[PDB]
Amino acid sequence: MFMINVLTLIIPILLAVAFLTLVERKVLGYMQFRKGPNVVGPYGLLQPIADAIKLFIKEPLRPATSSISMFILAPILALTLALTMWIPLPMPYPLINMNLGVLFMLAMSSLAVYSILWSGWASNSKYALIGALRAVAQTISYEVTLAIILLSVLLMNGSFTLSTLIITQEQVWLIFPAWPLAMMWFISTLAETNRAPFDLTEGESGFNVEYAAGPFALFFMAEYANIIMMNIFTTTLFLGAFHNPYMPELYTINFTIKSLLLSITFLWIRASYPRFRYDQLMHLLWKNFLPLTLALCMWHVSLPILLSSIPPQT
Amino acid sequence: SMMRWNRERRRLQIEDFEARIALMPLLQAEKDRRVLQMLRENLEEEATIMKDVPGWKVGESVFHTTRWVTPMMGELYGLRTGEEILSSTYGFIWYT
Amino acid sequence: MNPIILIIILMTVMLGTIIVMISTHWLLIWIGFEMNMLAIIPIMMKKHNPRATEASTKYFLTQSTASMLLMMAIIINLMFSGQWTVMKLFNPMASMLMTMALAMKLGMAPFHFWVPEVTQGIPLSSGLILLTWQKLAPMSVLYQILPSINLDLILTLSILSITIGGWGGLNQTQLRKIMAYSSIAHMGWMTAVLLYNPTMTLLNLIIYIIMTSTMFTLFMANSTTTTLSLSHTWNKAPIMTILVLITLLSMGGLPPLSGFMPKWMIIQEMTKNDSIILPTLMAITALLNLYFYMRLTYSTALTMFPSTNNMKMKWQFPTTKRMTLLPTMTVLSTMLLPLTPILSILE
Amino acid sequence: MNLMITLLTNFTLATLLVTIAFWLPQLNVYSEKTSPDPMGSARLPFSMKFFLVAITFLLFDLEIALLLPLPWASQTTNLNTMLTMALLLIFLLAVSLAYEWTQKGLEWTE
Amino acid sequence: VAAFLKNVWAKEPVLVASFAIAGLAVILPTLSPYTKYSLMINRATPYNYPVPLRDDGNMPDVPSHPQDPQGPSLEWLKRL
Amino acid sequence: PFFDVQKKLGVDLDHWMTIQSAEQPHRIPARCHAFEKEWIECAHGIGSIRAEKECKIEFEDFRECLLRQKTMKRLNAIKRQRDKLIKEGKYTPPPHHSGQEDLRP
Amino acid sequence: YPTKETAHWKPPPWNDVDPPKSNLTLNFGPQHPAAHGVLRLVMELSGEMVRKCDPHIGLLHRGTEKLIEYKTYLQALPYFDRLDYVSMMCNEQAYSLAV
Amino acid sequence: MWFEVLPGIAVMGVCLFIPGMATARIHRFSNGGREKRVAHYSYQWYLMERDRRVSGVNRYYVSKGLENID
Amino acid sequence: MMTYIVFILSIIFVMGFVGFSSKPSPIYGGLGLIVSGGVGCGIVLNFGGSFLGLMVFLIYLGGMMVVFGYTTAMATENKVVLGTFITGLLMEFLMVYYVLKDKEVEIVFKFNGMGDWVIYDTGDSGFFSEEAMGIAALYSYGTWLVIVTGWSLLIGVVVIMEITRGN
Amino acid sequence: MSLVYMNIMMAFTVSLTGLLMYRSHLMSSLLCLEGMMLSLFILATLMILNSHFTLASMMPIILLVFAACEAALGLSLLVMVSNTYGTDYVQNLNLLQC
């Protein structure tokens, strides 16, 4: 019975990631005064199916690798970490209800940079290794503000429990007392997933240009399996929905609608701006987000003490 | 809003803790009879097992003091099946 | 290096030594050693040349291995005692590991194999810091755990340090390596009397720090790092040859100099405890380091040398180098033996 | 226990899909390719700035590790001491950032 | 004092907001009247059992029942 | 040297994490709180030389609380004799040690 | 005391400084869209900085103006559409004003 | 026009609705028609194991009330 | 077999260290230390140290071994290795055979051969993890510890910026 | 005593012997050093959790933080060696033999 719960978690994750490609192409199409796919399925609904089948029957490279084993371990770690991020997400009840789900997700998302690093190792191209090192330094830069913003908010939560965060926002959204944290958090999750304006894997050649259609479709989909997750995590963190314990699907419809609107907000951001130069987003993290994030972390340390609003431990 | 709601949540937490406090003497009494039950059962089964061994004192304390020592996990669940052992030793850790 | 940053880093070195000296919890002992190592690494890389990077890497690896062995010793102490007081240990395995780890931090044999190299690669002021200030904290921890120190281990390490410091400096023309093998020999002399009388250990530590500080301060005052450049000192400043004469005679243990003071007292505290053979062969080995000191001052300090013409330019300029505490340290490193019962202030 | 079941299931599904991806087009006998990069064969030069941003991440991540028990530390009865040490730790993170700023450590990846 | 402040607010408004929020977070718990109640609520939260006292004969300030009028009360918390 | 700055200035830098018997958060006892308290109150002030020989019984009780070597040795002996009598067939487990009795509270 | 093994040991330098015993060169060839078509670029970088930028061209060199010498003026006119192929009638106008 | 993107968004929304409604129905099924017991803390685990003992059928969720006492 | 699971992880932990102390390369040495950190973290998580296990994942693996792999990438572009690997593996499996056939062993210390489920405690801790509140005590009882750790990290930043400059 | 402690100490001694006598990459020596730190973390954690000694629960984090800072320092030394020879082979660190 628990295995049925695991499968109804992880198979709809891959289906939602598949149709997120269609939603991306359609929404980017209409924002660009054109259409997205509408030929392959009715309203393009068979486009991700045809695309996944097309990739799975292309010839892989199997190049001269510095490591064959890490060439294999990069998609496996990517998909495994991209699927295990979803297991403490309370919607309204989680698969694994753990006391430290927030810190769990922070640690497992910190583990995701090894996919980028091993994919840069496995290609013998030294320029792909350079781009992988730039991607890793980008991701570990924005993990700092992820950790500190998340700590500042959990100072208003009371615990590391993700299901407590629904109880925290029963009166007000947590974007109202923490919108500067929310906007730096949202841009930092945008910079975590190598997503535009923070993507540096299409132009000055990325870390996963060595992969062609066997592992690539897996990498990509693991990457989008992070993106929805991060928005769902943002939905739990700043836009907490109403939970009726006798009708849990009210919460499930409400957080699903908010997470869809936030993933579409990612799509609507990448269709609206140019990219950063690499040192410009390093300037954005280390000189603009990090002083504000430290200042607001001091503010959210001292603020529940000065208002007598320290949240419950349990 | 977070001020009013966290003050309300601290009041609710104090109410839950006082329900716990009011239940704690009954749980303490049941726990005491639980562990003395398991120790007396282990004592009788040791008395019916450890007769072949020469020089054996059944129920011999390993401590030189005569103070009550809180029973260890393998003292209580030492002669029971592996299902109850695994439950009592990793159930809370493995719970979901 | 920015002088403010240099002051902050030297205060952090001092702060780590103070945390090791004053703290009652073993984790804070380990923290003080970590702080001391982390702070002393830039003092060795002051001049930024590859010899200092090699010396700092070797020093890092030895002190890091020693710190991990120290934490393993603390952890076995926690197994077998359930507590954390910096006092005697409650397991001979923790005793052995902590004695080994402190022997690695001091540079005692058989872990001496970094002390001549690292001291060679770093400047004279940082070598002064390494051979004087970095001895204070592990001698404090050895001072507090001596009810648990195995006698055979500490005496094996001590006499091995004395023999290797004796027979390692016979071959040496570099002044920093002579000071480093002298360091190893003096740490053997400090740790052999540790379980008998620790006040004489402290006496040897203070007299050693005074003589080593005198020698490195004269080295910085003359800018001499080799024997042959030390020979060119009489034609520039004749008093500096006299001072390196009397201080090297004191470090080997000549009477009536002050460096004869500790080790004589050490022999005086080892025959009380009915050990006759051990301080005998111990001072037999000290006669070998005194003997190459007497070659290194007879053959190459007293009888005056061929000079170079450019030295006659250097006659027209006096020393503007801050010779801080150098006359005080030179008087104390030579003329202190009539005040030998001052040692009771270290009880 | 159910957590290990979930982790093992995700690793199993990932290994299944990766093996099918690596070996379903290896059933094909497409063609054998010989195929005889911005840099040709030059050795990868060390970039000092990338290492500096990695170590700056590591040290600020340790300062984050010290900051992590604050939601539990807000529940203490010694709140004046706790608030003082929390503000001192975030201030020391800010001072490490200010020294990283003013000594030009955050330059060309600013 | 306002020329440098307007200059840094025109050049570096991120750092002005940062130093201002940091300064408020430092100084404001020393000025808030509610900082006393944080301490008071965190000591009123009963994580442990209220271990009873042996009645020696003279402890008038200790109640004999939870519903007795003497002892610590939480009416300051029920009102706020 | 142990320059006791903490006692000279009267400050508590690190005496609090030193022993298990100290003041813990939320009055949490250690598992060997009573044994360590007994051994510390035995060995207090008498010096380490007199403590190693005059407080041996408290220290053995406390070390055996920490490591439970005697308890595990006795459990090994009982479980091994029980396994021998199960292999020989001279003993059968009762229903309360086979899991057929629907536990008490 | 130099032995047989300790005989090649030269003394260390007098200032205790040894000698220290290069910049990257990239070749962004014709495999790239954000260069506007057919360009090779030999970059010489020093980290992030561009020390040198050497564009190699001729990847669309078609010998237009040798082909013009063997065609009439009317036949040479459509070559000018295909030079600046987002500025067709402007190049037509330039060549027409010339003729 | 712009309502052409809504079938893909609706399919993706159903795919995001399935895990939550699934785990809600499974937790109601496996726990006697009620929510899964949350045991983050050892007191919660102690009460839950005491429920498993007092139910008599080796299930924490089988609740016994005043009818179980005389 | 499930009762010995901590023990089973510990065996893998030993194997993992012999996996990388044989040292074929710093690349595979890093890979072995990451797998070893995962399994030793599982050991920590199975005793109830959930926050310390997530400190292994977030800070050791997710923070520091990332920097080791990063520096291995950027700075660092058999018989001895495989022999030391199989030597340590034979030593460890002979230790496992000894302690499983004897339920008692002495290499340096005396070690029981039953599982470590026996050595636990039978109590509860109410509405908190004791390990969580002990780590929360860093801000209330651990003042001097916070001071020396923050000063060491500030000095660590300063020291890294000194020695990486080369001037 | 406990049987998992023997395995953690044996892991510590394996990485200690891996540090000591190999004369290889410097990064491999830093990896053996941080394996020693990892085994110290696991062993301190199992002891402190075993004894329910609550105030020492912050001790392994300290054991992590300092030593990870230590690790950062070591990498910078390696990088300076990696800026001198082009390799981290420790047999290039033989200038100070004479």
Ligand SMILES: CCCCCCCCCCCCCCCCCC(=O)OC[C@H](COP(=O)([O-])OCC[N+](C)(C)C)OC(=O)CCCCCCCCCCCCCCCCC
């Ligand atoms: C989670 C739900 C959604 C959240 C909101 C996000 C949705 C909208 C997204 C829009 C598209 C964004 C695409 C990426 C853009 C990245 C670039 C960018 O914006 O850089 C950030 C820029 C960076 O600056 P810059 O790049 O504009 O300028 C260059 C930098 N200088 C000036 C130094 C040369 O701004 C910030 O860093 C601001 C971050 C948030 C600030 C929050 C301030 C709080 C206010 C406190 C009070 C202030 C008043 C004074 C004190 C009062 C005291 C009582």
Ligand SMILES: CCCCCCCCCCCCCCCCCC(=O)OC[C@H](COP(=O)(O)OCCN)OC(=O)CCCCCCCCCCCCCCCCC
């Ligand atoms: C190259 C190698 C292969 C690489 C690919 C595969 C590995 C990477 C992807 C998988 C990562 C696995 C991470 C597993 C542990 C995560 C942390 C964790 O368990 O936290 C959750 C929880 C803590 O919360 P709490 O509520 O306190 O616990 C219940 C107590 N009431 O704790 C619990 O609920 C405790 C449950 C019991 C203990 C769980 C132990 C899990 C197994 C150990 C790790 C296995 C993976 C090892 C490799 C890691 C990566 C290198």
Ligand SMILES: CCCCCCCCCCCCCCCCCC(=O)OC[C@H](COP(=O)(O)OCCN)OC(=O)CCCCCCCCCCCCCCCCC
């Ligand atoms: C029980 C134990 C309790 C504690 C007891 C006390 C222990 C004392 C241990 C003393 C150790 C001193 C180490 C050296 C001093 C520390 C700071 C330092 O290094 O100063 C030297 C300084 C460096 O300046 P810089 O510009 O870098 O020089 C390069 C040359 N261009 O400037 C120079 O280089 C100038 C040249 C002269 C420097 C001489 C310094 C002498 C210091 C030692 C004094 C004697 C010891 C104290 C008395 C005995 C105590 C035991």
Ligand SMILES: CCCCCCCCCCCCCCCCCC(=O)OC[C@H](COP(=O)(O)OCCN)OC(=O)CCCCCCCCCCCCCCCCC
């Ligand atoms: C006491 C309160 C608590 C203080 C500690 C906590 C601080 C929280 C934020 C942490 C920030 C960490 C990094 C800070 C570095 C500061 C130094 C600095 O940035 O100086 C350089 C800068 C000129 O910029 P530049 O060097 O060119 O850098 C590239 C950008 N152009 O020059 C500047 O930007 C000038 C900076 C100084 C002027 C700022 C004034 C702000 C005033 C706000 C209102 C009053 C707030 C009360 C506190 C007083 C603050 C001064």
Ligand SMILES: CCCCCCCCCCCCCCCCCC(=O)OC[C@H](COP(=O)(O)OCCN)OC(=O)CCCCCCCCCCCCCCCCC
């Ligand atoms: C959580 C929700 C998840 C939802 C995921 C699915 C979303 C999309 C759902 C399907 C949408 C409609 C698809 C219609 C496809 C085209 C059908 C068709 O007519 O194909 C015609 C083709 C050839 O026909 P022929 O007979 O040759 O024509 C000559 C006529 N004189 O004939 C053929 O090609 C043969 C028939 C092919 C039919 C394919 C239908 C789509 C299959 C998609 C797989 C997933 C289905 C849903 C799974 C979940 C529900 C069970």
Ligand SMILES: C=C(C)[C@H]1Cc2c(ccc3c2O[C@@H]2COc4cc(OC)c(OC)cc4[C@@H]2C3=O)O1
């Ligand atoms: C996961 C499934 C079912 C399929 C669909 C799919 C892949 C793998 C990769 C991709 C993909 O869908 C789209 C295809 O088209 C673009 C076009 C893009 O830009 C034009 C673009 O920019 C980032 C991104 C993309 C996706 C992309 O890379 O596997």
Ligand SMILES: C=C(C)[C@H]1Cc2c(ccc3c2O[C@H]2COc4cc(OC)c(OC)cc4[C@@H]2C3=O)O1
């Ligand atoms: C070369 C070194 C290291 C030493 C050894 C040495 C000298 C200098 C001078 C002499 C010397 O050898 C000694 C040998 O034996 C005695 C014995 C003496 O008295 C016992 C005595 O009294 C003055 C004088 C002497 C020699 C003497 O003049 O420097």
